[PDB]
Amino acid sequence: MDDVIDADYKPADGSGGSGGSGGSQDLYATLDVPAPIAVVGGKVRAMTLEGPVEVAVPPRTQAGRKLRLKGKGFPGPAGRGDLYLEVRIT
């Protein structure tokens, strides 16, 4: 089932590594996405423990949406965790 709509990002000068050490594979964070960038579906820079990252916003996004960046959370050698972003239209 499509719970969260499928989302992705890229580390904008962010610094990962071969993790899998645990800590918190998943991270919970809140996303400032401007109203024009929500409707068109562009990218917005989210703050994480790894640093600044540019997250692909889906075309025609509403406030109160939820994103789960699967295999894109905390570092891991065979696969990464998830990054759960709560969409807020700015």
Side-chain angles (χ1 to χ4, degrees):
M1 293 178 176
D2 179 84
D3 175 70
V4 291
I5 183 176
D6 186 48
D8 179 43
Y9 78 82
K10 293 296 168 296
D13 297 82
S15 183
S18 53
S21 53
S24 298
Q25 300 174 30
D26 50 277
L27 290 180
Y28 288 79
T30 321
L31 187 60
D32 292 89
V33 49
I37 304 183
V39 177
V40 305
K43 281 186 294 297
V44 291
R45 189 168 292 221
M47 295 268 70
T48 54
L49 310 190
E50 194 177 308
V53 304
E54 303 186 310
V55 184
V57 182
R60 307 181 190 272
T61 288
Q62 302 73 30
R65 279 193 173 181
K66 41 175 178 57
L67 303 173
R68 197 170 191 151
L69 304 162
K70 301 184 183 167
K72 299 293 164 62
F74 234 53
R80 274 211 296 172
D82 63 92
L83 174 60
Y84 193 79
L85 287 178
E86 297 180 271
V87 171
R88 308 304 182 227
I89 289 187
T90 308

Coordinates of all heavy atoms in Angstrom, one line a residue:
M1 N 0.8 -1.2 0.0 CA 0.0 0.0 0.0 C 0.9 1.2 0.0 O 1.9 1.3 0.7 CB -0.9 0.0 1.2 CG -2.0 -1.1 1.3 SD -3.0 -1.0 2.8 CE -4.2 -2.3 2.5
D2 N 0.4 2.3 -0.7 CA 1.0 3.6 -0.7 C 0.6 4.3 0.6 O -0.5 4.9 0.6 CB 0.6 4.4 -2.0 CG 1.2 5.8 -2.0 OD1 2.4 6.0 -2.5 OD2 0.5 6.8 -1.6
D3 N 1.4 4.1 1.7 CA 1.2 4.9 2.9 C 1.7 6.3 2.7 O 1.0 7.3 2.5 CB 1.9 4.2 4.1 CG 1.8 5.0 5.4 OD1 0.7 5.1 6.0 OD2 2.8 5.6 5.9
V4 N 3.1 6.4 2.8 CA 3.8 7.6 2.3 C 4.1 7.5 0.8 O 4.3 6.3 0.3 CB 5.2 7.7 3.1 CG1 5.0 8.0 4.6 CG2 6.0 6.4 3.0
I5 N 4.0 8.6 0.1 CA 4.3 8.6 -1.3 C 5.9 8.5 -1.5 O 6.6 9.1 -0.6 CB 3.8 9.9 -2.1 CG1 4.1 9.9 -3.6 CG2 4.3 11.2 -1.4 CD1 3.5 11.0 -4.4
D6 N 6.3 7.8 -2.5 CA 7.7 7.4 -2.7 C 8.6 8.7 -3.0 O 8.3 9.4 -4.0 CB 7.9 6.4 -3.8 CG 9.3 5.9 -4.0 OD1 10.0 5.5 -3.0 OD2 9.8 5.8 -5.2
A7 N 9.5 8.9 -2.1 CA 10.4 10.2 -2.1 C 11.8 9.8 -2.1 O 12.2 8.6 -1.8 CB 10.0 11.0 -0.9
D8 N 12.7 10.7 -2.5 CA 14.2 10.5 -2.7 C 14.9 11.8 -2.4 O 14.3 12.9 -2.4 CB 14.5 9.9 -4.1 CG 15.9 9.7 -4.4 OD1 16.7 9.1 -3.5 OD2 16.4 10.0 -5.5
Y9 N 16.3 11.7 -2.1 CA 17.1 12.9 -2.0 C 18.6 12.6 -2.4 O 18.9 11.4 -2.8 CB 17.1 13.4 -0.5 CG 17.9 12.6 0.5 CD1 19.3 12.9 0.7 CD2 17.4 11.7 1.4 CE1 20.1 12.2 1.6 CE2 18.2 11.1 2.3 CZ 19.5 11.3 2.4 OH 20.3 10.7 3.4
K10 N 19.4 13.6 -2.3 CA 20.9 13.5 -2.6 C 21.6 14.4 -1.6 O 21.2 15.6 -1.4 CB 21.2 14.0 -4.1 CG 20.6 13.1 -5.2 CD 21.3 11.6 -5.1 CE 20.5 10.6 -6.0 NZ 19.1 10.4 -5.5
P11 N 22.7 13.9 -1.0 CA 23.5 14.6 0.1 C 24.3 15.8 -0.5 O 25.3 15.7 -1.2 CB 24.5 13.5 0.6 CG 24.7 12.5 -0.5 CD 23.3 12.5 -1.2
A12 N 23.7 17.0 -0.3 CA 24.3 18.3 -0.7 C 25.5 18.6 0.2 O 25.4 19.3 1.2 CB 23.3 19.4 -0.7
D13 N 26.7 18.1 -0.2 CA 28.0 18.2 0.6 C 27.9 17.4 1.9 O 28.8 17.5 2.8 CB 28.4 19.6 0.8 CG 28.7 20.4 -0.4 OD1 27.8 20.9 -1.1 OD2 29.9 20.5 -0.8
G14 N 26.9 16.5 2.0 CA 26.7 15.6 3.2 C 27.7 14.5 3.3 O 28.2 14.1 2.2
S15 N 28.1 14.1 4.5 CA 29.2 13.1 4.7 C 28.8 11.9 5.5 O 28.5 11.9 6.7 CB 30.4 13.9 5.5 OG 31.5 13.0 5.6
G16 N 28.6 10.8 4.7 CA 28.2 9.5 5.3 C 29.4 8.6 5.6 O 30.5 9.1 5.9
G17 N 29.2 7.3 5.4 CA 30.3 6.3 5.7 C 29.7 4.9 5.7 O 28.4 4.7 5.5
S18 N 30.5 3.8 5.9 CA 30.0 2.5 6.1 C 29.5 2.3 7.6 O 30.3 2.0 8.5 CB 31.1 1.5 5.8 OG 32.3 1.8 6.5
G19 N 28.2 2.6 7.8 CA 27.6 2.6 9.1 C 27.2 1.2 9.5 O 28.0 0.3 9.6
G20 N 25.9 1.0 9.8 CA 25.3 -0.2 10.3 C 25.6 -0.5 11.8 O 25.5 -1.6 12.3
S21 N 26.1 0.6 12.5 CA 26.5 0.5 13.9 C 25.3 0.7 14.8 O 25.5 0.6 16.1 CB 27.6 1.6 14.2 OG 27.1 2.9 13.7
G22 N 24.1 0.9 14.3 CA 22.9 1.0 15.0 C 22.6 2.5 15.2 O 22.4 3.3 14.3
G23 N 22.5 2.9 16.5 CA 22.1 4.3 16.9 C 20.6 4.5 16.6 O 19.8 4.2 17.5
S24 N 20.3 5.0 15.4 CA 18.9 5.2 14.9 C 18.9 5.1 13.4 O 19.2 6.1 12.8 CB 18.4 6.5 15.4 OG 18.3 6.6 16.9
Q25 N 18.6 3.9 12.9 CA 18.6 3.6 11.4 C 17.6 4.6 10.7 O 17.9 5.2 9.7 CB 18.2 2.2 11.1 CG 19.2 1.1 11.7 CD 18.7 -0.3 11.5 OE1 18.0 -0.6 10.5 NE2 19.0 -1.2 12.4
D26 N 16.4 4.7 11.4 CA 15.4 5.7 11.0 C 15.7 7.0 11.7 O 16.2 7.0 12.9 CB 14.0 5.2 11.3 CG 13.8 4.6 12.7 OD1 14.2 3.4 12.9 OD2 13.3 5.3 13.6
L27 N 15.4 8.1 11.1 CA 15.4 9.5 11.7 C 14.0 10.2 11.4 O 13.5 10.0 10.3 CB 16.5 10.4 11.1 CG 18.0 10.0 11.5 CD1 19.0 10.9 10.9 CD2 18.2 10.0 13.0
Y28 N 13.5 10.9 12.4 CA 12.3 11.7 12.3 C 12.7 13.2 12.3 O 13.3 13.7 13.2 CB 11.4 11.4 13.5 CG 10.7 10.0 13.4 CD1 11.4 8.8 13.8 CD2 9.4 9.8 13.0 CE1 10.8 7.6 13.7 CE2 8.8 8.6 12.9 CZ 9.5 7.5 13.3 OH 8.9 6.2 13.2
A29 N 12.3 13.8 11.2 CA 12.6 15.2 10.9 C 11.4 15.9 10.2 O 10.5 15.2 9.7 CB 13.9 15.4 10.1
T30 N 11.3 17.2 10.2 CA 10.2 18.0 9.7 C 10.7 18.8 8.5 O 11.9 19.3 8.5 CB 9.6 19.0 10.7 OG1 9.5 18.3 12.0 CG2 8.2 19.4 10.3
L31 N 9.9 18.9 7.4 CA 10.4 19.4 6.1 C 9.7 20.8 5.7 O 8.5 20.8 5.6 CB 10.1 18.4 5.0 CG 10.7 18.7 3.5 CD1 12.2 18.9 3.6 CD2 10.2 17.7 2.5
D32 N 10.5 21.8 5.6 CA 10.1 23.1 5.1 C 10.1 23.1 3.5 O 11.2 23.2 2.9 CB 11.0 24.3 5.6 CG 10.8 24.6 7.1 OD1 11.6 24.0 7.9 OD2 10.0 25.4 7.5
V33 N 8.9 22.9 2.9 CA 8.8 22.9 1.4 C 7.8 24.1 1.1 O 6.7 24.1 1.4 CB 8.2 21.6 0.8 CG1 7.0 21.0 1.6 CG2 7.9 21.7 -0.7
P34 N 8.4 25.2 0.4 CA 7.6 26.3 -0.1 C 6.4 25.9 -1.0 O 6.5 24.9 -1.7 CB 8.6 27.1 -0.9 CG 9.9 26.8 -0.3 CD 9.8 25.4 0.1
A35 N 5.3 26.6 -0.9 CA 4.0 26.4 -1.6 C 4.2 26.2 -3.2 O 3.8 25.2 -3.7 CB 3.0 27.5 -1.4
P36 N 5.0 27.1 -3.9 CA 5.3 26.9 -5.3 C 6.1 25.6 -5.6 O 5.7 24.8 -6.6 CB 6.2 28.1 -5.7 CG 6.7 28.6 -4.4 CD 5.7 28.4 -3.4
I37 N 7.1 25.2 -4.8 CA 7.9 24.0 -4.9 C 7.1 22.7 -4.6 O 7.4 21.7 -5.2 CB 9.2 24.1 -4.0 CG1 10.0 25.4 -4.3 CG2 10.1 22.9 -4.1 CD1 11.3 25.6 -3.6
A38 N 6.1 22.9 -3.8 CA 5.2 21.8 -3.5 C 4.3 21.4 -4.7 O 4.2 20.2 -5.1 CB 4.3 22.1 -2.3
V39 N 3.7 22.4 -5.3 CA 2.8 22.3 -6.5 C 3.5 21.8 -7.7 O 3.1 20.9 -8.4 CB 2.1 23.7 -6.8 CG1 1.2 23.6 -8.0 CG2 1.3 24.1 -5.5
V40 N 4.7 22.4 -8.0 CA 5.5 22.0 -9.2 C 6.2 20.6 -8.9 O 6.4 19.8 -9.8 CB 6.6 23.1 -9.6 CG1 5.9 24.4 -9.9 CG2 7.7 23.2 -8.6
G41 N 6.6 20.4 -7.6 CA 7.4 19.2 -7.3 C 8.9 19.4 -7.7 O 9.3 18.8 -8.7
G42 N 9.6 20.2 -6.9 CA 11.0 20.4 -7.1 C 11.9 19.7 -6.1 O 11.7 18.5 -5.8
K43 N 12.9 20.4 -5.6 CA 13.7 19.9 -4.4 C 13.8 21.0 -3.4 O 13.8 22.2 -3.7 CB 15.2 19.5 -4.8 CG 15.2 18.1 -5.5 CD 16.7 17.6 -5.8 CE 17.4 18.4 -6.9 NZ 16.7 18.3 -8.2
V44 N 13.9 20.6 -2.1 CA 14.1 21.5 -0.9 C 15.2 20.9 0.0 O 15.2 19.7 0.2 CB 12.8 21.8 -0.1 CG1 11.8 22.6 -0.9 CG2 12.2 20.4 0.4
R45 N 16.0 21.8 0.6 CA 17.1 21.4 1.4 C 16.7 21.1 2.9 O 16.2 22.0 3.6 CB 18.3 22.4 1.3 CG 19.6 21.9 2.0 CD 20.8 22.9 1.7 NE 21.1 22.8 0.2 CZ 22.4 22.8 -0.3 NH1 23.5 22.8 0.5 NH2 22.6 22.6 -1.6
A46 N 16.8 19.8 3.3 CA 16.5 19.4 4.7 C 17.8 19.2 5.5 O 18.8 18.8 5.0 CB 15.7 18.0 4.6
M47 N 17.7 19.6 6.8 CA 18.8 19.5 7.7 C 18.7 18.1 8.4 O 17.7 17.7 9.0 CB 18.7 20.6 8.8 CG 18.9 22.0 8.3 SD 20.6 22.6 8.3 CE 21.4 21.6 7.1
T48 N 19.8 17.4 8.4 CA 20.0 16.0 9.0 C 21.3 15.9 9.7 O 22.1 16.8 9.7 CB 19.8 14.9 7.9 OG1 20.8 15.1 6.9 CG2 18.4 14.7 7.4
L49 N 21.5 14.8 10.4 CA 22.7 14.5 11.2 C 23.9 14.3 10.2 O 25.1 14.6 10.6 CB 22.6 13.2 12.1 CG 21.3 13.2 13.0 CD1 21.3 12.0 14.0 CD2 21.0 14.5 13.7
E50 N 23.7 13.9 9.0 CA 24.7 13.7 7.9 C 25.0 15.1 7.3 O 26.1 15.2 6.7 CB 24.2 12.8 6.8 CG 25.3 12.2 5.9 CD 24.8 11.2 4.8 OE1 24.1 10.2 5.2 OE2 25.1 11.4 3.6
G51 N 24.2 16.1 7.4 CA 24.4 17.5 6.9 C 23.2 18.0 6.1 O 22.1 17.5 6.3
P52 N 23.4 19.0 5.2 CA 22.4 19.4 4.2 C 22.2 18.5 3.1 O 23.1 17.9 2.5 CB 22.9 20.8 3.8 CG 24.4 20.7 3.9 CD 24.7 19.7 5.0
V53 N 20.9 18.2 2.8 CA 20.5 17.2 1.7 C 19.3 17.9 0.9 O 18.5 18.6 1.4 CB 20.0 15.8 2.3 CG1 21.1 15.2 3.2 CG2 18.7 15.9 3.1
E54 N 19.3 17.6 -0.4 CA 18.2 18.2 -1.3 C 17.2 17.1 -1.7 O 17.5 16.2 -2.4 CB 18.8 18.8 -2.6 CG 19.9 19.9 -2.3 CD 20.4 20.7 -3.5 OE1 20.8 20.0 -4.5 OE2 20.4 21.9 -3.5
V55 N 16.0 17.2 -1.1 CA 14.9 16.2 -1.2 C 13.9 16.5 -2.3 O 13.3 17.6 -2.3 CB 14.1 16.1 0.2 CG1 13.1 15.0 0.2 CG2 15.1 16.0 1.4
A56 N 13.8 15.5 -3.2 CA 12.8 15.5 -4.3 C 11.4 15.5 -3.8 O 10.9 14.5 -3.3 CB 13.0 14.3 -5.3
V57 N 10.7 16.7 -3.8 CA 9.3 16.9 -3.5 C 8.4 16.4 -4.7 O 8.7 16.7 -5.8 CB 9.0 18.4 -3.3 CG1 7.5 18.6 -2.9 CG2 10.0 19.0 -2.2
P58 N 7.4 15.5 -4.4 CA 6.5 15.0 -5.4 C 5.7 16.2 -6.1 O 5.3 17.1 -5.4 CB 5.6 14.0 -4.7 CG 5.8 14.3 -3.2 CD 7.2 14.8 -3.1
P59 N 5.4 16.2 -7.4 CA 4.5 17.2 -8.0 C 3.1 17.2 -7.5 O 2.4 16.1 -7.4 CB 4.5 16.8 -9.5 CG 5.7 16.0 -9.7 CD 5.9 15.3 -8.4
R60 N 2.6 18.4 -7.0 CA 1.3 18.7 -6.4 C 1.2 18.0 -5.0 O 0.5 17.0 -4.8 CB 0.1 18.2 -7.4 CG 0.2 18.8 -8.8 CD -1.0 18.4 -9.7 NE -0.8 18.8 -11.1 CZ -1.1 19.9 -11.7 NH1 -1.7 20.9 -11.0 NH2 -0.9 20.1 -13.0
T61 N 1.9 18.7 -4.1 CA 2.1 18.2 -2.7 C 1.2 19.1 -1.8 O 1.2 20.3 -1.9 CB 3.6 18.3 -2.3 OG1 4.3 17.2 -2.9 CG2 3.8 18.2 -0.8
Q62 N 0.5 18.5 -0.8 CA -0.3 19.1 0.2 C 0.4 19.1 1.5 O 1.3 18.3 1.8 CB -1.7 18.4 0.3 CG -2.6 18.3 -1.0 CD -2.0 17.3 -2.0 OE1 -1.4 16.3 -1.6 NE2 -2.3 17.6 -3.3
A63 N 0.0 20.1 2.4 CA 0.5 20.1 3.8 C -0.1 19.0 4.6 O -1.3 18.6 4.4 CB 0.2 21.5 4.5
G64 N 0.6 18.4 5.6 CA 0.2 17.2 6.4 C 0.5 15.9 5.7 O 0.1 14.8 6.2
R65 N 1.2 16.0 4.5 CA 1.8 14.8 3.9 C 3.0 14.2 4.8 O 3.5 14.9 5.6 CB 2.3 15.0 2.5 CG 1.2 15.0 1.4 CD 1.8 14.9 0.0 NE 0.8 14.8 -1.1 CZ 1.1 14.7 -2.4 NH1 2.4 14.7 -2.9 NH2 0.1 14.6 -3.3
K66 N 3.3 13.0 4.5 CA 4.4 12.3 5.1 C 5.2 11.6 4.0 O 4.7 11.0 3.1 CB 3.9 11.3 6.2 CG 2.6 10.5 5.8 CD 2.2 9.4 6.9 CE 1.0 8.7 6.5 NZ 1.1 8.0 5.2
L67 N 6.6 11.7 4.2 CA 7.5 11.1 3.2 C 8.4 10.1 4.0 O 8.7 10.4 5.2 CB 8.4 12.2 2.6 CG 7.7 13.3 1.8 CD1 8.7 14.4 1.4 CD2 6.9 12.8 0.6
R68 N 8.7 8.9 3.5 CA 9.7 8.0 4.1 C 10.8 7.7 3.0 O 10.5 6.9 2.1 CB 9.0 6.8 4.7 CG 9.8 6.0 5.7 CD 9.0 4.9 6.4 NE 9.7 4.3 7.5 CZ 9.2 3.8 8.6 NH1 7.9 3.8 8.8 NH2 10.1 3.5 9.6
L69 N 12.0 8.2 3.2 CA 13.1 8.1 2.3 C 13.8 6.7 2.6 O 14.7 6.7 3.4 CB 14.0 9.3 2.5 CG 13.4 10.7 2.3 CD1 14.2 11.8 3.0 CD2 13.1 11.0 0.9
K70 N 13.3 5.7 2.0 CA 13.7 4.3 2.3 C 15.1 4.0 1.7 O 15.4 4.4 0.5 CB 12.7 3.3 1.6 CG 11.2 3.4 2.1 CD 10.3 2.4 1.5 CE 8.9 2.5 2.0 NZ 7.9 1.7 1.1
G71 N 16.0 3.4 2.5 CA 17.4 3.1 2.1 C 18.2 4.4 2.0 O 19.2 4.4 1.3
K72 N 17.7 5.5 2.6 CA 18.2 6.8 2.6 C 18.3 7.5 4.0 O 18.4 8.7 4.1 CB 17.4 7.7 1.6 CG 17.4 7.2 0.1 CD 18.8 7.3 -0.6 CE 18.9 6.4 -1.8 NZ 18.0 6.8 -2.9
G73 N 18.2 6.7 5.0 CA 18.4 7.2 6.4 C 19.8 7.1 6.9 O 20.7 7.5 6.1
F74 N 20.0 6.6 8.1 CA 21.3 6.4 8.7 C 22.2 5.4 7.9 O 21.6 4.4 7.4 CB 21.2 5.9 10.2 CG 21.9 6.7 11.2 CD1 21.7 8.1 11.3 CD2 22.7 6.1 12.2 CE1 22.3 8.8 12.3 CE2 23.4 6.8 13.2 CZ 23.1 8.2 13.2
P75 N 23.5 5.7 7.7 CA 24.4 4.8 6.9 C 24.4 3.3 7.3 O 24.1 3.0 8.5 CB 25.8 5.4 7.2 CG 25.5 6.8 7.4 CD 24.2 6.9 8.1
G76 N 24.6 2.4 6.3 CA 24.6 0.9 6.5 C 25.3 0.2 5.4 O 25.1 0.6 4.2
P77 N 26.2 -0.8 5.6 CA 27.1 -1.4 4.6 C 26.3 -2.1 3.5 O 26.7 -2.0 2.3 CB 28.0 -2.4 5.4 CG 27.1 -2.7 6.6 CD 26.4 -1.5 7.0
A78 N 25.3 -2.8 3.8 CA 24.5 -3.6 2.9 C 23.2 -2.9 2.5 O 22.6 -3.2 1.4 CB 24.1 -5.0 3.5
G79 N 22.8 -1.9 3.2 CA 21.7 -1.0 3.0 C 21.5 0.0 4.1 O 21.8 -0.3 5.3
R80 N 20.9 1.2 3.8 CA 20.7 2.3 4.7 C 19.3 2.1 5.4 O 18.5 1.3 5.0 CB 20.9 3.6 4.0 CG 22.4 4.1 4.0 CD 22.5 5.7 4.0 NE 21.9 6.3 2.8 CZ 21.8 7.7 2.7 NH1 22.2 8.5 3.7 NH2 21.3 8.2 1.6
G81 N 19.1 2.9 6.5 CA 17.8 3.1 7.1 C 16.8 3.9 6.3 O 16.9 4.0 5.1
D82 N 15.9 4.6 7.0 CA 14.9 5.5 6.4 C 15.0 6.9 7.0 O 15.4 7.0 8.2 CB 13.5 4.9 6.4 CG 12.9 4.7 7.8 OD1 12.3 5.7 8.3 OD2 13.1 3.7 8.4
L83 N 14.6 7.9 6.3 CA 14.4 9.3 6.8 C 13.0 9.8 6.6 O 12.6 10.0 5.5 CB 15.4 10.2 6.2 CG 15.3 11.8 6.5 CD1 15.5 12.0 8.0 CD2 16.3 12.6 5.7
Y84 N 12.3 9.8 7.7 CA 10.8 10.2 7.7 C 10.7 11.7 7.9 O 10.9 12.3 8.9 CB 10.2 9.4 8.9 CG 8.7 9.4 8.9 CD1 8.0 8.5 8.0 CD2 7.9 10.3 9.7 CE1 6.6 8.5 8.0 CE2 6.5 10.2 9.7 CZ 5.9 9.3 8.8 OH 4.5 9.3 8.8
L85 N 10.2 12.4 6.8 CA 10.0 13.8 6.7 C 8.5 14.2 6.7 O 7.7 13.7 5.9 CB 10.7 14.4 5.4 CG 12.2 14.5 5.4 CD1 12.7 15.0 4.0 CD2 12.8 15.3 6.6
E86 N 8.1 15.0 7.7 CA 6.7 15.5 7.8 C 6.6 16.8 6.9 O 7.2 17.8 7.3 CB 6.3 15.8 9.3 CG 6.3 14.6 10.2 CD 5.9 14.9 11.6 OE1 6.8 15.3 12.4 OE2 4.7 14.9 12.0
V87 N 5.9 16.7 5.8 CA 5.7 17.8 4.9 C 4.9 19.0 5.5 O 3.8 18.8 6.0 CB 4.9 17.3 3.6 CG1 4.5 18.5 2.7 CG2 5.8 16.3 2.8
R88 N 5.6 20.2 5.6 CA 5.0 21.4 6.0 C 5.1 22.4 4.8 O 6.2 22.7 4.4 CB 5.7 22.0 7.2 CG 5.8 21.1 8.4 CD 4.5 20.5 8.9 NE 4.7 19.7 10.1 CZ 4.2 18.5 10.3 NH1 3.4 17.9 9.4 NH2 4.4 17.8 11.5
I89 N 4.0 22.9 4.3 CA 4.0 23.9 3.2 C 4.3 25.3 3.8 O 3.5 25.8 4.7 CB 2.6 23.9 2.4 CG1 2.5 22.6 1.5 CG2 2.5 25.2 1.5 CD1 1.4 22.6 0.5
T90 N 5.4 25.8 3.4 CA 5.9 27.1 3.9 C 5.3 28.2 3.0 O 5.5 28.2 1.8 CB 7.5 27.0 3.8 OG1 8.0 25.8 4.4 CG2 8.2 28.2 4.4

